[PDB]
Structure formats: C-alpha cells, structure tokens
Design a protein around this ligand. Sequence first.
Ligand SMILES: CC(=O)N1Cc2ccc(N)cc2C1
Lengths: 412, 412
Amino acid sequence: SRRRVVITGMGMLSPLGLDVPSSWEGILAGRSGIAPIEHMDLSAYSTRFGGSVKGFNVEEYLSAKEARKLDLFIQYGLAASFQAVRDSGLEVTDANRERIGVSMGSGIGGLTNIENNCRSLFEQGPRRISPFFVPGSIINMVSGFLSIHLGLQGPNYALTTAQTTGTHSIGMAARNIAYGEADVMVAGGSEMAACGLGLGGFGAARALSTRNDEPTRASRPWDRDRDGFVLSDGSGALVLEELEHARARGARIYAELVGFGMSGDAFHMTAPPEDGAGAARCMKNALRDAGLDPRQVDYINAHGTSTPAGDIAEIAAVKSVFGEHAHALSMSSTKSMTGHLLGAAGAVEAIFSVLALRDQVAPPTINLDNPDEGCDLDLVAHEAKPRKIDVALSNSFGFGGTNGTLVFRRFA
Amino acid sequence: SRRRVVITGMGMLSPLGLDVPSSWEGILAGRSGIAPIEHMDLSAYSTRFGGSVKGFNVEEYLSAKEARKLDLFIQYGLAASFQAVRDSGLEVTDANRERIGVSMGSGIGGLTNIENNCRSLFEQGPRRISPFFVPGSIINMVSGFLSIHLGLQGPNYALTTAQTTGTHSIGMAARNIAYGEADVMVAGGSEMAACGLGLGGFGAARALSTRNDEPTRASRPWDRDRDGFVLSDGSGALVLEELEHARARGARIYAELVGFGMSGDAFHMTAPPEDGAGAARCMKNALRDAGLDPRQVDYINAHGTSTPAGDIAEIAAVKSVFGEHAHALSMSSTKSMTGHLLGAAGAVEAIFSVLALRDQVAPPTINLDNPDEGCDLDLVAHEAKPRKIDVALSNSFGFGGTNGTLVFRRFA
Ligand SMILES: CC(=O)N1Cc2ccc(N)cc2C1
C-alpha cells in the first residue's frame, strides 16, 4: 500500500536570493525583494515593478551554448532542480535511474521567448523564428532537460495549474512515490512572466498592485490598503523520497510530506469564492489525507496574494476549518516579501514551510500595518515569531477555481 | 489493492470530423483531413497545409461572450469535454460533485491568442491587451472552465508534456480513480498551434513535411519518402469512471483502462534514441501495470508521426518488447490521416484505440506505399483490417524524452 514521503533536497531562486539559505535569511529578516523592473522599458505600463531574480548567473549551471536556447523560466527551474539534487546528496546510477523522475511545472512558461520570436515574426518574418522556439519555451522542458542532464528515466511530466502549479507539482510527485511509481521525484515549479504580455495581460485584468512609487510596500496581504498582487520570478524544487530509501542511504530529512489536497471551487475563472469554500474543502481533504486533528496545525503559509477578495477568502477558509484553533495557530504570507511567483509560488512556499519546521519560526507578513475587517488571526505582522511548529500547511489557489494544500510535519 | 477504471464517454474535434462517429468513419475509410490552411497567409512558410478543424461552431457549447474570452485550443477542449460528459449520461449532483475532477491538457496552449495580443502590443502598445488574455490563454482553463460549467469539485488540474500530453492526462486521471481520489474524471487534451508561431516554430526546426504539392500524402509513417510530421488541430476527451460506479448507474462501457506507463528516455531534447529504449521501457512498465504478458497485445496505435527518426525508433521498441509476437500484433499510425494534434494526439488516439476494441478492426496506416529499411511489421498499410482485439496500446513520445503508454482491454 501507501509509502511515506520525506524532503531530502531543496533549491530556489527568489527575488530574495540565488539559493535557499540566502532566500530564507531575507524571509526571517522581513526583507523585500520587490523593486522597479530594469530589463525592459515599462513607461507605457500601469505596473513598472516586480520581484526580479537579481544577479542570476546561468553559467553556474549550464554552458552558454545551451543557456542561449532556453527561456529564463527553464533556466530558473534547472538552477533550482540542480541545487535540490546536489542538496539531497543522491547519486543517480543504472541501479536507481529508472526510479527517479521529475515534475517541474510553470503557470505560463516561456512567455518572454514567445514574445521575442513574435517580434521576429512580425518585424522580420517566419524565417527568423529560432529553431529552438518550441523546445526552449514549452513548460515540460524543465522536467525534460533535467532528465537529459541527470539521466532521470523515471516518471517525466509537468503540471500547469496557474498559481497552484508548485503545490500540485509537489503533491502529485509525492503520490507517485506514495503509490510506488517512483522512489525519488524532483518537484516544484519556475516562472518568468515579467515581459510585455505578462505585465500587460495581468495589467489589462487590473489584478496587479499599481504602487509604482513604493514597490516594497505593494505586497501587503490582509492590509486594508492592498490593491493587487506583485508579479515575481524564480523557482522552487524539492527532492521527494520514499522514507525507507532515504533511511537506507542515510539522507538528511528536513521533514515528512503527510498530506496533499486538491479541489476545484467550480466558482469562477479568476475570482475566489469570498466564503473560502474551495480553500476550506482543499485543507479538509489534505488534513484527512494526513490523518490529523486540525488542532495539530501550528503554522499556515497562506497563498496571501495581496488581492482584496483572495486574502479575505483565506481568513474565512481558516476560521471555518480550524474553528477556535484558528486563534492558536500562526498564518503568514511570504508573498509580503517575495511577491507572487505564480506557478513557482507553491514551490518556494513549500520550502519556506519546511524551513519553519526545521527552525521553529513563523515567517512574517511585512506591511500588515492595518489588518482588514475580520483579519483578526495571528498573521505574524512585521516580524518573524519563534514558536512550536510540529505541523505546517502551505495553501495555493489559481485561475480555474484550482486549489492545493500540502501538509508537512517534523521528522525525528 | 486498486479500483478498476472504465471508459463510459468520449468526445472529439479532429481534422476528420466535429465528433467521434464522424472522425471514426473517416479513420476506417482511410480519409485524409489534411489540406492547404485557409484564413491565414502562409506565402513565407515552407509548410502551407495541415489538419484544420473544419466547420466548428463554438456556440453549440458556449455563448459568443464566453467563447470570445477563450483561445481556440480551450474552445476545442471544452467541445470534446462537453461531448464526452453527454456521451456518458453522467448526472452531476450535490452527492457526487466532490468525486468528479478534470485533467485536460495541452502541449503548447494559447499560441494563437498570444500571437494576436502580441500583434496589438507591437502596433498600439499594452492598453490593447485583452483583460482575458491570461485566463483565456493558460493551459489549465479547459479544466477550469469545464469544472465551473459542470460544477466539478474533484481533482482539478492540467498536464503539459508536449506531444505526450493527451496520454499522460488520461493515464494520471485513471490513477486518481484507482487510488480512490475520484470516482469520475474528464481527461484528454486540446491543441491549435496552426498559427504563424506553430508552423514557423516547427518549420524552423525543419520538423514539418514540406510536400505542399500533395498534402494528403505528406503524412506517411514508416514510408521511405516521409519528410517530417503534419501539424493538426483538435481535441479528445474521455469520461473515466470507477467500474462499480459505472455498473450502479447502468453506464455504457466502451472498454477498460487496465495499464499506464510513463518513462523518460533521458536521451535528447527533440530526438528519440534509434533503438526505442524509452518507448520499450514505457510499454514494459504499462504492461506490468496491467499485469499482462506482451503476447496478449493485439493492436498498437503508434505515435507514428512521419519523422525519419521517430517512426524507425518505434519499430525498434516494439521488436525489443514483443520479440516473437511483434509481427502478430497489428500497429498503425492514425496520424497517417489526422496528422499530429500534438498534446491532443494521445487523447484522439486513445479514443481510436477504444473503438478498435469496440469494432474489432485495426485502423489503416494510409500512404505506406514503400516501407523503409526494417519496417516489416503489420503496419496495416492502406485499408482498415478486421481482426481479434482484446488488448490495445496507445503510445505517445514527446520533446524532453517524455513517454506515455495506455493499455485498454475489451469489457464483457
Ligand atoms: C453539441 C454537443 O454535443 N453538446 C454537449 C453539451 C454539453 C453541455 C453544453 N453546455 C453544451 C453542449 C453541446
């Protein structure tokens, strides 16, 4: 039957740093990775800032010759994938390669790449479209390229479920191992949507904070002055591993993955139900899946996108699932500092959640100066809060009424 | 032990018709759906033909208002999903809605919408980007929109595994049911990449047939004159159902899905290994999953893309897997008539594999006028072949070395 699943490796690019420890240091210090965007000219855009990955050197991972053929999202996913695999100390052999797979996803994928070849197509013509446009841009090629580079011959796929992609990717990889389709999976996601179509598209839908004159205070989840999410780039990857396999080889285990929930809201293409009915169903499935009393949950890492409707939905979802225990746990949004990595949001927040467990600290919600109507839970405003965390939960919600929950606990 | 999964409903948009019975009539008569592409200037392109969905009326499915928000690939996916659900006679209720989920995917997604919003971005700047650009273009919106429209609250997600997408979607939907996460799933894929960026993308990699003089003859898997694949558009969708839930409501069962294989080649970003190592591993994994010996397999719907390296690698794979049984089974490429629907290839080709079981006939590989070196198997050249079929394989292989196999068995 169902095997248990532990975290043996983590890798990350965020607007807070080029690895996990540097990113985490910023999280505990309540530092913002949000700044005006420099790689393009956004004077015609209603939003001109985001969470860029700053100082990324792809030639720490790939030959410039390969890197040139690949969209930044693919570069970011490989960067985090390679970190996580090295962090696991796992050796890939002919003996285990067929039992090691990969599920790295993206919400949008190679939008910069499609934008640039679109430029070439319209300004010059079809014959200037790169021969590398398809394999360098489509979402499954983080899983593809990682498998080619490392010899991973296990299950090879990618999810695209918008802002839920990282949680879905991690959770379903765990089910791969749980049910014995694999002993190891590299799982998470990557996003680089900070191009014309991305900032314009989200801008057109009026979803983005337009606080161009103070980018670091734009992402203010549950604050009454919130005006949309902040668009950020990066990657999260975890090495998920069957528990006995991890023990046999003496792997360092950060935490166990005990619970995964999915659920459609069936409510609206882009709007979350104000009652949190979808988040509620999802967390309930995931806590059942983990065989837990909801009162065991100590820390929740919220979706916490800093949109009006999304944030309030999540208070209502947590009050409804946890009843009075909603006032005992701590809930925070690391999106306060990183902004919204979209399909990678689930991945980086999975790792922040595992790190709350290791270090016994609730990350802060920075910029929560004036909590909104009903937002009366412990939201770890401003400053990290050292506390007892046995069980941590990470929530994601996306367009299509798509929901995911991951439940982690300490392994000893 | 594990719940059994059956097919109770099927839906399709293809170059051979706007539904399954019309597509299947096409298939068994050896008709081509390939023609010069219209309503689009391909003067500057090396390929000017493909498999277009001819005569599609989205308003049979959606309001004009709904449909104007959504890329053709999503319209195609919804059409297939709606056909399939209706074909199943499933009643969605408050009692069962949490146990009905969706896994509809795409290889490439919303190229045509990205192209048109790009046209507007480059000519007039970002204030001409549709506010429905993002949710109207991202790959999870077939699953999103279907779930919202039918009120489905089960597992809500999408796969994107290039030309393997449709197969992976159906396969991992089947897993959700087997391991009791859902009782019903709508699964498959949709694709409409016949924009400048698709034909130009694949054209730039010289992956496409350039036989503009005889478009019906361009797709010729295992023929010595083949010169790359034909780009085709459309959708497949299956209603997957746990057996006891099918029988309890007196569902018409087309066939049972007994076996699912995934596997990475870990070989090359675009190229398959010459010896079908990947396809071999994947078919072996799928037959082991089904608890079947290779001698039990009667019909294989090949990937059969009409690429020099792709077609011959599949011959290698089958010979390696089926040894002294490889000439006994019939193996045909329906891409000989449909061309390559990319991420929807696996969905439509799963349906054709189910109807091969229902009607006891192997669909032809048309245009196999001169089989290449080593292509001495029963590739059902030119005409449909009635024969005994108890076990059917549908193989899919994609960029990133991503493999998928589905094993269907007759039900009586
Ligand atoms: C043409 C056809 O087969 N259908 C099935 C179906 C199901 C639901 C909705 N909204 C619309 C339609 C149209």
